[PDB]
């Protein structure tokens, strides 16, 4: 939980250059229904708190692991946006593209591990 956020920050920060991450309710839901949905990132220091309901709804609907950390700053930076977003999910290529060979493998690796620890806790 302590180092988890860190690993996630660096992971998204790297993959960010590849544009393998998206933000916005329309984005998270778009991938959630499409299938390319990867790892959902939720900021514990961002409003509105709608994310609280969008968390169980998106999971109970499609089921996707996410992380709860007030990294508002990291979110905006990793996303390359003006203001700090609220709901940001990472999209590792695609359903089949998930088996990439590039750095994507590393990023996903750290993500799965982290998203898993938090998902279980």
DSSP string, 50-109: THHHHHHHHHHHT---EEE---HHHHHHHHT-SS--SEEEE--S-TTGGG-SSTHHHHHH
CA distance 94 to 72: 26
* Separation in Å, CA 82 to CA 12, 79, 85: 17, 9, 9
Domain count, the chain: 1
HSE of 118, CA atoms in CB hemisphere, 13 A: 23
Supply the DSSP symbol for 12: H
**Dist. CA 30–CA 27, nearest whole Å:** 5
Q: How far apart are CA 46 and CA 86, in angstroms?
A: 6
Q: How was this structure determined?
A: NMR
* 82 φ, ψ (degrees, to nearest 5): -65, -65
| Alpha carbons 80 and 21: distance in angstroms, whole number | 10
Query: Which range of residues forms the domain containing residue 32?
Result: 1-121
CATH number, domain containing residue 12: 3.30.1330.30
3-class secondary structure, 20: coil
Residue 43 has which token pair? 């900021």
């Amino acid at each position: 939980s302590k180092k988890l956020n860190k690993k996630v920050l660096k992971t998204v920060k790297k993959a960010s250059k590849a544009k393998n991450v998206k933000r916005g309710v329309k984005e998270v839901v778009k991938a959630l229904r499409k299938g390319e949905k990867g790892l959902v990132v939720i900021a514990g220091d961002i409003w509105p708190a709608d994310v609280i309901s969008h968390i169980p709804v998106l999971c109970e609907d499609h089921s996707v692991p996410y992380i709860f950390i007030p990294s508002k700053q990291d979110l905006g930076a990793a996303g390359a946006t003006k203001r700090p977003t609220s709901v940001v999910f990472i999209v590792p290529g695609s359903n089949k593209k998930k088996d990439g060979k590039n750095k994507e493998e590393e990023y996903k690796e750290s993500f799965n591990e982290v998203v898993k620890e938090v998902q279980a806790l």
